[PDB]
mmCIF file with all atom_site columns, C-alpha atoms and ligand atoms in Angstrom:
data_model
loop_
_atom_site.group_PDB
_atom_site.id
_atom_site.type_symbol
_atom_site.label_atom_id
_atom_site.label_alt_id
_atom_site.label_comp_id
_atom_site.label_asym_id
_atom_site.label_entity_id
_atom_site.label_seq_id
_atom_site.pdbx_PDB_ins_code
_atom_site.Cartn_x
_atom_site.Cartn_y
_atom_site.Cartn_z
_atom_site.occupancy
_atom_site.B_iso_or_equiv
_atom_site.pdbx_formal_charge
_atom_site.auth_seq_id
_atom_site.auth_comp_id
_atom_site.auth_asym_id
_atom_site.auth_atom_id
_atom_site.pdbx_PDB_model_num
ATOM   1   C  CA  . UNK A 1 1   ? 63.749 152.791 44.366 1.00 0.00 ? 283 UNK A CA  1
ATOM   2   C  CA  . UNK A 1 2   ? 64.733 152.354 40.634 1.00 0.00 ? 284 UNK A CA  1
ATOM   3   C  CA  . UNK A 1 3   ? 65.000 155.702 38.473 1.00 0.00 ? 285 UNK A CA  1
ATOM   4   C  CA  . UNK A 1 4   ? 63.728 153.892 35.366 1.00 0.00 ? 286 UNK A CA  1
ATOM   5   C  CA  . UNK A 1 5   ? 60.328 152.308 34.598 1.00 0.00 ? 287 UNK A CA  1
ATOM   6   C  CA  . UNK A 1 6   ? 60.406 148.349 35.191 1.00 0.00 ? 288 UNK A CA  1
ATOM   7   C  CA  . UNK A 1 7   ? 58.293 147.765 32.087 1.00 0.00 ? 289 UNK A CA  1
ATOM   8   C  CA  . UNK A 1 8   ? 59.801 150.291 29.431 1.00 0.00 ? 290 UNK A CA  1
ATOM   9   C  CA  . UNK A 1 9   ? 63.081 151.042 31.057 1.00 0.00 ? 291 UNK A CA  1
ATOM   10  C  CA  . UNK A 1 10  ? 62.746 154.854 30.436 1.00 0.00 ? 292 UNK A CA  1
ATOM   11  C  CA  . UNK A 1 11  ? 62.944 157.534 32.887 1.00 0.00 ? 293 UNK A CA  1
ATOM   12  C  CA  . UNK A 1 12  ? 60.017 160.218 33.259 1.00 0.00 ? 294 UNK A CA  1
ATOM   13  C  CA  . UNK A 1 13  ? 57.150 160.616 35.677 1.00 0.00 ? 295 UNK A CA  1
ATOM   14  C  CA  . UNK A 1 14  ? 57.348 157.452 37.927 1.00 0.00 ? 296 UNK A CA  1
ATOM   15  C  CA  . UNK A 1 15  ? 55.392 156.089 40.739 1.00 0.00 ? 297 UNK A CA  1
ATOM   16  C  CA  . UNK A 1 16  ? 57.485 154.052 43.221 1.00 0.00 ? 298 UNK A CA  1
ATOM   17  C  CA  . UNK A 1 17  ? 56.433 150.801 44.979 1.00 0.00 ? 299 UNK A CA  1
ATOM   18  C  CA  . UNK A 1 18  ? 56.447 151.082 48.652 1.00 0.00 ? 300 UNK A CA  1
ATOM   19  C  CA  . UNK A 1 19  ? 57.175 147.361 49.251 1.00 0.00 ? 301 UNK A CA  1
ATOM   20  C  CA  . UNK A 1 20  ? 59.892 146.895 46.575 1.00 0.00 ? 302 UNK A CA  1
ATOM   21  C  CA  . UNK A 1 21  ? 62.442 149.086 44.716 1.00 0.00 ? 303 UNK A CA  1
ATOM   22  C  CA  . UNK A 1 22  ? 60.468 148.831 41.354 1.00 0.00 ? 304 UNK A CA  1
ATOM   23  C  CA  . UNK A 1 23  ? 58.893 152.060 39.670 1.00 0.00 ? 305 UNK A CA  1
ATOM   24  C  CA  . UNK A 1 24  ? 56.329 152.408 36.783 1.00 0.00 ? 306 UNK A CA  1
ATOM   25  C  CA  . UNK A 1 25  ? 54.733 154.951 34.602 1.00 0.00 ? 307 UNK A CA  1
ATOM   26  C  CA  . UNK A 1 26  ? 51.092 155.533 35.219 1.00 0.00 ? 308 UNK A CA  1
ATOM   27  C  CA  . UNK A 1 27  ? 50.000 153.567 32.211 1.00 0.00 ? 309 UNK A CA  1
ATOM   28  C  CA  . UNK A 1 28  ? 52.938 151.081 32.073 1.00 0.00 ? 310 UNK A CA  1
ATOM   29  C  CA  . UNK A 1 29  ? 51.733 149.319 35.299 1.00 0.00 ? 311 UNK A CA  1
ATOM   30  C  CA  . UNK A 1 30  ? 48.745 147.046 34.900 1.00 0.00 ? 312 UNK A CA  1
ATOM   31  C  CA  . UNK A 1 31  ? 46.333 147.972 36.217 1.00 0.00 ? 313 UNK A CA  1
ATOM   32  C  CA  . UNK A 1 32  ? 47.123 151.684 35.810 1.00 0.00 ? 314 UNK A CA  1
ATOM   33  C  CA  . UNK A 1 33  ? 48.635 153.283 38.931 1.00 0.00 ? 315 UNK A CA  1
ATOM   34  C  CA  . UNK A 1 34  ? 45.920 153.929 41.549 1.00 0.00 ? 316 UNK A CA  1
ATOM   35  C  CA  . UNK A 1 35  ? 45.378 157.846 42.264 1.00 0.00 ? 317 UNK A CA  1
ATOM   36  C  CA  . UNK A 1 36  ? 46.045 157.560 46.090 1.00 0.00 ? 318 UNK A CA  1
ATOM   37  C  CA  . UNK A 1 37  ? 46.856 154.365 48.361 1.00 0.00 ? 319 UNK A CA  1
ATOM   38  C  CA  . UNK A 1 38  ? 49.676 155.044 50.719 1.00 0.00 ? 320 UNK A CA  1
ATOM   39  C  CA  . UNK A 1 39  ? 51.674 152.846 51.005 1.00 0.00 ? 321 UNK A CA  1
ATOM   40  C  CA  . UNK A 1 40  ? 51.079 151.391 47.418 1.00 0.00 ? 322 UNK A CA  1
ATOM   41  C  CA  . UNK A 1 41  ? 52.222 147.770 46.262 1.00 0.00 ? 323 UNK A CA  1
ATOM   42  C  CA  . UNK A 1 42  ? 52.980 146.965 42.710 1.00 0.00 ? 324 UNK A CA  1
ATOM   43  C  CA  . UNK A 1 43  ? 51.692 143.957 40.833 1.00 0.00 ? 325 UNK A CA  1
ATOM   44  C  CA  . UNK A 1 44  ? 55.083 142.123 41.310 1.00 0.00 ? 326 UNK A CA  1
ATOM   45  C  CA  . UNK A 1 45  ? 54.516 142.437 45.236 1.00 0.00 ? 327 UNK A CA  1
ATOM   46  C  CA  . UNK A 1 46  ? 50.861 141.601 45.022 1.00 0.00 ? 328 UNK A CA  1
ATOM   47  C  CA  . UNK A 1 47  ? 51.652 138.359 43.005 1.00 0.00 ? 329 UNK A CA  1
ATOM   48  C  CA  . UNK A 1 48  ? 54.243 137.460 45.651 1.00 0.00 ? 330 UNK A CA  1
ATOM   49  C  CA  . UNK A 1 49  ? 51.771 137.817 48.280 1.00 0.00 ? 331 UNK A CA  1
ATOM   50  C  CA  . UNK A 1 50  ? 49.337 135.299 46.649 1.00 0.00 ? 332 UNK A CA  1
ATOM   51  C  CA  . UNK A 1 51  ? 52.262 132.619 46.533 1.00 0.00 ? 333 UNK A CA  1
ATOM   52  C  CA  . UNK A 1 52  ? 53.140 133.376 50.246 1.00 0.00 ? 334 UNK A CA  1
ATOM   53  C  CA  . UNK A 1 53  ? 49.543 133.119 51.479 1.00 0.00 ? 335 UNK A CA  1
ATOM   54  C  CA  . UNK A 1 54  ? 48.892 129.840 49.718 1.00 0.00 ? 336 UNK A CA  1
ATOM   55  C  CA  . UNK A 1 55  ? 52.346 128.004 49.036 1.00 0.00 ? 337 UNK A CA  1
ATOM   56  C  CA  . UNK A 1 56  ? 50.465 124.990 47.558 1.00 0.00 ? 338 UNK A CA  1
ATOM   57  C  CA  . UNK A 1 57  ? 49.413 127.444 44.754 1.00 0.00 ? 339 UNK A CA  1
ATOM   58  C  CA  . UNK A 1 58  ? 52.959 126.691 43.278 1.00 0.00 ? 340 UNK A CA  1
ATOM   59  C  CA  . UNK A 1 59  ? 52.456 122.868 42.824 1.00 0.00 ? 341 UNK A CA  1
ATOM   60  C  CA  . UNK A 1 60  ? 51.962 121.832 39.275 1.00 0.00 ? 342 UNK A CA  1
ATOM   61  C  CA  . UNK A 1 61  ? 48.722 122.341 37.311 1.00 0.00 ? 343 UNK A CA  1
ATOM   62  C  CA  . UNK A 1 62  ? 47.280 121.184 33.988 1.00 0.00 ? 344 UNK A CA  1
ATOM   63  C  CA  . UNK A 1 63  ? 46.840 123.890 31.446 1.00 0.00 ? 345 UNK A CA  1
ATOM   64  C  CA  . UNK A 1 64  ? 43.180 122.731 30.823 1.00 0.00 ? 346 UNK A CA  1
ATOM   65  C  CA  . UNK A 1 65  ? 42.057 123.229 34.460 1.00 0.00 ? 347 UNK A CA  1
ATOM   66  C  CA  . UNK A 1 66  ? 43.857 126.642 34.632 1.00 0.00 ? 348 UNK A CA  1
ATOM   67  C  CA  . UNK A 1 67  ? 41.872 127.842 31.490 1.00 0.00 ? 349 UNK A CA  1
ATOM   68  C  CA  . UNK A 1 68  ? 38.514 126.975 32.567 1.00 0.00 ? 350 UNK A CA  1
ATOM   69  C  CA  . UNK A 1 69  ? 39.030 129.016 35.890 1.00 0.00 ? 351 UNK A CA  1
ATOM   70  C  CA  . UNK A 1 70  ? 36.602 131.856 36.266 1.00 0.00 ? 352 UNK A CA  1
ATOM   71  C  CA  . UNK A 1 71  ? 38.018 135.350 36.382 1.00 0.00 ? 353 UNK A CA  1
ATOM   72  C  CA  . UNK A 1 72  ? 37.768 136.029 40.056 1.00 0.00 ? 354 UNK A CA  1
ATOM   73  C  CA  . UNK A 1 73  ? 40.083 138.610 41.640 1.00 0.00 ? 355 UNK A CA  1
ATOM   74  C  CA  . UNK A 1 74  ? 43.275 136.438 41.950 1.00 0.00 ? 356 UNK A CA  1
ATOM   75  C  CA  . UNK A 1 75  ? 43.108 135.157 38.272 1.00 0.00 ? 357 UNK A CA  1
ATOM   76  C  CA  . UNK A 1 76  ? 42.214 138.581 37.067 1.00 0.00 ? 358 UNK A CA  1
ATOM   77  C  CA  . UNK A 1 77  ? 45.556 139.730 38.746 1.00 0.00 ? 359 UNK A CA  1
ATOM   78  C  CA  . UNK A 1 78  ? 47.631 136.850 37.403 1.00 0.00 ? 360 UNK A CA  1
ATOM   79  C  CA  . UNK A 1 79  ? 46.341 137.820 33.776 1.00 0.00 ? 361 UNK A CA  1
ATOM   80  C  CA  . UNK A 1 80  ? 47.298 141.467 34.314 1.00 0.00 ? 362 UNK A CA  1
ATOM   81  C  CA  . UNK A 1 81  ? 50.738 140.253 35.348 1.00 0.00 ? 363 UNK A CA  1
ATOM   82  C  CA  . UNK A 1 82  ? 51.302 137.979 32.374 1.00 0.00 ? 364 UNK A CA  1
ATOM   83  C  CA  . UNK A 1 83  ? 50.022 140.770 30.183 1.00 0.00 ? 365 UNK A CA  1
ATOM   84  C  CA  . UNK A 1 84  ? 52.451 143.050 31.914 1.00 0.00 ? 366 UNK A CA  1
ATOM   85  C  CA  . UNK A 1 85  ? 55.374 140.616 31.363 1.00 0.00 ? 367 UNK A CA  1
ATOM   86  C  CA  . UNK A 1 86  ? 54.844 140.852 27.694 1.00 0.00 ? 368 UNK A CA  1
ATOM   87  C  CA  . UNK A 1 87  ? 54.993 144.643 27.589 1.00 0.00 ? 369 UNK A CA  1
ATOM   88  C  CA  . UNK A 1 88  ? 58.308 144.307 29.557 1.00 0.00 ? 370 UNK A CA  1
ATOM   89  C  CA  . UNK A 1 89  ? 59.857 142.803 26.217 1.00 0.00 ? 371 UNK A CA  1
ATOM   90  C  CA  . UNK A 1 90  ? 60.764 145.696 23.802 1.00 0.00 ? 372 UNK A CA  1
ATOM   91  C  CA  . UNK A 1 91  ? 59.535 143.529 20.962 1.00 0.00 ? 373 UNK A CA  1
ATOM   92  C  CA  . UNK A 1 92  ? 56.017 143.874 22.353 1.00 0.00 ? 374 UNK A CA  1
ATOM   93  C  CA  . UNK A 1 93  ? 56.058 147.286 20.512 1.00 0.00 ? 375 UNK A CA  1
ATOM   94  C  CA  . UNK A 1 94  ? 55.099 145.400 17.272 1.00 0.00 ? 376 UNK A CA  1
ATOM   95  C  CA  . UNK A 1 95  ? 52.009 144.000 18.841 1.00 0.00 ? 377 UNK A CA  1
ATOM   96  C  CA  . UNK A 1 96  ? 50.767 146.843 21.142 1.00 0.00 ? 378 UNK A CA  1
ATOM   97  C  CA  . UNK A 1 97  ? 48.502 148.849 18.723 1.00 0.00 ? 379 UNK A CA  1
ATOM   98  C  CA  . UNK A 1 98  ? 45.869 148.167 16.113 1.00 0.00 ? 380 UNK A CA  1
ATOM   99  C  CA  . UNK A 1 99  ? 47.705 146.604 13.092 1.00 0.00 ? 381 UNK A CA  1
ATOM   100 C  CA  . UNK A 1 100 ? 46.745 146.929 9.380  1.00 0.00 ? 382 UNK A CA  1
ATOM   101 C  CA  . UNK A 1 101 ? 47.078 144.445 6.570  1.00 0.00 ? 383 UNK A CA  1
ATOM   102 C  CA  . UNK A 1 102 ? 48.162 145.379 2.931  1.00 0.00 ? 384 UNK A CA  1
ATOM   103 C  CA  . UNK A 1 103 ? 50.813 143.046 1.772  1.00 0.00 ? 385 UNK A CA  1
ATOM   104 C  CA  . UNK A 1 104 ? 51.148 141.498 -1.739 1.00 0.00 ? 386 UNK A CA  1
ATOM   105 C  CA  . UNK A 1 105 ? 50.084 137.922 -1.598 1.00 0.00 ? 387 UNK A CA  1
ATOM   106 C  CA  . UNK A 1 106 ? 48.660 138.067 1.922  1.00 0.00 ? 388 UNK A CA  1
ATOM   107 C  CA  . UNK A 1 107 ? 45.217 138.580 3.097  1.00 0.00 ? 389 UNK A CA  1
ATOM   108 C  CA  . UNK A 1 108 ? 44.653 140.000 6.747  1.00 0.00 ? 390 UNK A CA  1
ATOM   109 C  CA  . UNK A 1 109 ? 43.097 138.096 9.760  1.00 0.00 ? 391 UNK A CA  1
ATOM   110 C  CA  . UNK A 1 110 ? 39.465 137.478 10.021 1.00 0.00 ? 392 UNK A CA  1
ATOM   111 C  CA  . UNK A 1 111 ? 39.867 138.572 13.847 1.00 0.00 ? 393 UNK A CA  1
ATOM   112 C  CA  . UNK A 1 112 ? 42.678 141.052 14.438 1.00 0.00 ? 394 UNK A CA  1
ATOM   113 C  CA  . UNK A 1 113 ? 43.905 141.459 17.892 1.00 0.00 ? 395 UNK A CA  1
ATOM   114 C  CA  . UNK A 1 114 ? 46.481 143.539 19.785 1.00 0.00 ? 396 UNK A CA  1
ATOM   115 C  CA  . UNK A 1 115 ? 47.804 143.964 23.211 1.00 0.00 ? 397 UNK A CA  1
ATOM   116 C  CA  . UNK A 1 116 ? 46.264 147.394 23.822 1.00 0.00 ? 398 UNK A CA  1
ATOM   117 C  CA  . UNK A 1 117 ? 42.922 145.624 23.138 1.00 0.00 ? 399 UNK A CA  1
ATOM   118 C  CA  . UNK A 1 118 ? 43.553 142.845 25.404 1.00 0.00 ? 400 UNK A CA  1
ATOM   119 C  CA  . UNK A 1 119 ? 44.477 145.479 27.965 1.00 0.00 ? 401 UNK A CA  1
ATOM   120 C  CA  . UNK A 1 120 ? 41.286 147.365 27.566 1.00 0.00 ? 402 UNK A CA  1
ATOM   121 C  CA  . UNK A 1 121 ? 39.401 144.114 27.736 1.00 0.00 ? 403 UNK A CA  1
ATOM   122 C  CA  . UNK A 1 122 ? 40.923 143.181 31.177 1.00 0.00 ? 404 UNK A CA  1
ATOM   123 C  CA  . UNK A 1 123 ? 40.303 146.566 32.570 1.00 0.00 ? 405 UNK A CA  1
ATOM   124 C  CA  . UNK A 1 124 ? 36.584 146.535 31.473 1.00 0.00 ? 406 UNK A CA  1
ATOM   125 C  CA  . UNK A 1 125 ? 36.216 142.955 32.859 1.00 0.00 ? 407 UNK A CA  1
ATOM   126 C  CA  . UNK A 1 126 ? 35.281 141.408 29.530 1.00 0.00 ? 408 UNK A CA  1
ATOM   127 C  CA  . UNK A 1 127 ? 36.658 138.052 30.235 1.00 0.00 ? 409 UNK A CA  1
ATOM   128 C  CA  . UNK A 1 128 ? 34.704 135.622 32.374 1.00 0.00 ? 410 UNK A CA  1
ATOM   129 C  CA  . UNK A 1 129 ? 37.437 132.766 32.207 1.00 0.00 ? 411 UNK A CA  1
ATOM   130 C  CA  . UNK A 1 130 ? 41.191 132.654 31.901 1.00 0.00 ? 412 UNK A CA  1
ATOM   131 C  CA  . UNK A 1 131 ? 40.714 130.870 28.588 1.00 0.00 ? 413 UNK A CA  1
ATOM   132 C  CA  . UNK A 1 132 ? 39.365 134.147 27.028 1.00 0.00 ? 414 UNK A CA  1
ATOM   133 C  CA  . UNK A 1 133 ? 42.431 136.101 27.945 1.00 0.00 ? 415 UNK A CA  1
ATOM   134 C  CA  . UNK A 1 134 ? 44.799 133.370 26.732 1.00 0.00 ? 416 UNK A CA  1
ATOM   135 C  CA  . UNK A 1 135 ? 42.902 132.881 23.585 1.00 0.00 ? 417 UNK A CA  1
ATOM   136 C  CA  . UNK A 1 136 ? 43.218 136.439 22.530 1.00 0.00 ? 418 UNK A CA  1
ATOM   137 C  CA  . UNK A 1 137 ? 46.942 136.602 23.611 1.00 0.00 ? 419 UNK A CA  1
ATOM   138 C  CA  . UNK A 1 138 ? 47.837 133.655 21.457 1.00 0.00 ? 420 UNK A CA  1
ATOM   139 C  CA  . UNK A 1 139 ? 45.500 134.936 18.513 1.00 0.00 ? 421 UNK A CA  1
ATOM   140 C  CA  . UNK A 1 140 ? 48.008 137.940 18.311 1.00 0.00 ? 422 UNK A CA  1
ATOM   141 C  CA  . UNK A 1 141 ? 50.764 135.790 17.435 1.00 0.00 ? 423 UNK A CA  1
ATOM   142 C  CA  . UNK A 1 142 ? 48.960 133.349 15.420 1.00 0.00 ? 424 UNK A CA  1
ATOM   143 C  CA  . UNK A 1 143 ? 47.552 136.254 13.067 1.00 0.00 ? 425 UNK A CA  1
ATOM   144 C  CA  . UNK A 1 144 ? 51.152 137.511 12.612 1.00 0.00 ? 426 UNK A CA  1
ATOM   145 C  CA  . UNK A 1 145 ? 52.579 134.034 11.665 1.00 0.00 ? 427 UNK A CA  1
ATOM   146 C  CA  . UNK A 1 146 ? 49.794 133.525 9.145  1.00 0.00 ? 428 UNK A CA  1
ATOM   147 C  CA  . UNK A 1 147 ? 50.088 137.127 7.663  1.00 0.00 ? 429 UNK A CA  1
ATOM   148 C  CA  . UNK A 1 148 ? 53.784 137.525 7.233  1.00 0.00 ? 430 UNK A CA  1
ATOM   149 C  CA  . UNK A 1 149 ? 54.383 133.843 5.867  1.00 0.00 ? 431 UNK A CA  1
ATOM   150 C  CA  . UNK A 1 150 ? 57.738 133.158 4.799  1.00 0.00 ? 432 UNK A CA  1
ATOM   151 C  CA  . UNK A 1 151 ? 59.028 136.808 5.399  1.00 0.00 ? 433 UNK A CA  1
ATOM   152 C  CA  . UNK A 1 152 ? 61.528 136.677 8.323  1.00 0.00 ? 434 UNK A CA  1
ATOM   153 C  CA  . UNK A 1 153 ? 59.601 139.187 10.233 1.00 0.00 ? 435 UNK A CA  1
ATOM   154 C  CA  . UNK A 1 154 ? 57.415 136.198 11.352 1.00 0.00 ? 436 UNK A CA  1
ATOM   155 C  CA  . UNK A 1 155 ? 60.254 135.528 13.918 1.00 0.00 ? 437 UNK A CA  1
ATOM   156 C  CA  . UNK A 1 156 ? 58.966 138.434 16.041 1.00 0.00 ? 438 UNK A CA  1
ATOM   157 C  CA  . UNK A 1 157 ? 55.682 136.485 16.728 1.00 0.00 ? 439 UNK A CA  1
ATOM   158 C  CA  . UNK A 1 158 ? 57.661 133.313 17.621 1.00 0.00 ? 440 UNK A CA  1
ATOM   159 C  CA  . UNK A 1 159 ? 59.916 135.129 19.883 1.00 0.00 ? 441 UNK A CA  1
ATOM   160 C  CA  . UNK A 1 160 ? 57.141 137.339 21.793 1.00 0.00 ? 442 UNK A CA  1
ATOM   161 C  CA  . UNK A 1 161 ? 54.898 134.258 22.054 1.00 0.00 ? 443 UNK A CA  1
ATOM   162 C  CA  . UNK A 1 162 ? 57.795 132.424 23.688 1.00 0.00 ? 444 UNK A CA  1
ATOM   163 C  CA  . UNK A 1 163 ? 57.902 135.203 26.275 1.00 0.00 ? 445 UNK A CA  1
ATOM   164 C  CA  . UNK A 1 164 ? 54.107 134.890 26.803 1.00 0.00 ? 446 UNK A CA  1
ATOM   165 C  CA  . UNK A 1 165 ? 54.149 130.968 27.063 1.00 0.00 ? 447 UNK A CA  1
ATOM   166 C  CA  . UNK A 1 166 ? 57.137 130.898 29.569 1.00 0.00 ? 448 UNK A CA  1
ATOM   167 C  CA  . UNK A 1 167 ? 55.478 133.495 31.712 1.00 0.00 ? 449 UNK A CA  1
ATOM   168 C  CA  . UNK A 1 168 ? 52.159 131.612 31.424 1.00 0.00 ? 450 UNK A CA  1
ATOM   169 C  CA  . UNK A 1 169 ? 53.772 128.433 32.675 1.00 0.00 ? 451 UNK A CA  1
ATOM   170 C  CA  . UNK A 1 170 ? 55.377 130.355 35.661 1.00 0.00 ? 452 UNK A CA  1
ATOM   171 C  CA  . UNK A 1 171 ? 52.722 132.547 36.843 1.00 0.00 ? 453 UNK A CA  1
ATOM   172 C  CA  . UNK A 1 172 ? 49.910 129.901 36.631 1.00 0.00 ? 454 UNK A CA  1
ATOM   173 C  CA  . UNK A 1 173 ? 52.413 127.155 37.946 1.00 0.00 ? 455 UNK A CA  1
ATOM   174 C  CA  . UNK A 1 174 ? 51.767 124.712 34.980 1.00 0.00 ? 456 UNK A CA  1
ATOM   175 C  CA  . UNK A 1 175 ? 53.134 121.263 35.731 1.00 0.00 ? 457 UNK A CA  1
ATOM   176 C  CA  . UNK A 1 176 ? 56.601 121.004 34.197 1.00 0.00 ? 458 UNK A CA  1
ATOM   177 C  CA  . UNK A 1 177 ? 57.153 118.370 31.308 1.00 0.00 ? 459 UNK A CA  1
ATOM   178 C  CA  . UNK A 1 178 ? 59.393 117.291 28.522 1.00 0.00 ? 460 UNK A CA  1
HETATM 179 ZN ZN1 . ZN  B 2 .   ? 57.262 152.726 31.376 1.00 0.00 ? 103 ZN  B ZN1 1
HETATM 180 ZN ZN1 . ZN  B 2 .   ? 56.574 146.065 44.423 1.00 0.00 ? 104 ZN  B ZN1 1
HETATM 181 ZN ZN1 . ZN  B 2 .   ? 46.945 127.935 53.399 1.00 0.00 ? 105 ZN  B ZN1 1
#
């Protein structure tokens, strides 16, 4: 197994996957690492299995159909992965915890959103459709764009949203286009 966390790339107290060489801090993994379960498989391994059990799952999909899907166990899982994929980028540090808004010439968002809040929402089963998860994800970056305006710090929202969107297309097998 790896000696660093797959998500944050730091050593420390790590739980090793029994079916692949990745390791995780307790709270870096989504969902949080399960107390017992021997062997244990990580979310990378659980997502792999879904594709292997239904290879047709990787044919192209329309985003509109993906969003309207109900949050049954397999969609819940894919959203937990996608979220995890964003935390693997170090730049997610800027979007992780609750932000606050006091900049000259800007006004803060009507509806503030952050990754730890999305994380909590997923864990408490507050989304009924994929749409709800993806709306809040995108809200994160959209609030950052509007707030930071022409300050170059706005690029952090573009950068991190690109990670989100690429990984959304991958994980949910969105039909490729130009
Ligand atoms: Zn970690
Ligand atoms: Zn694994
Ligand atoms: Zn089949």
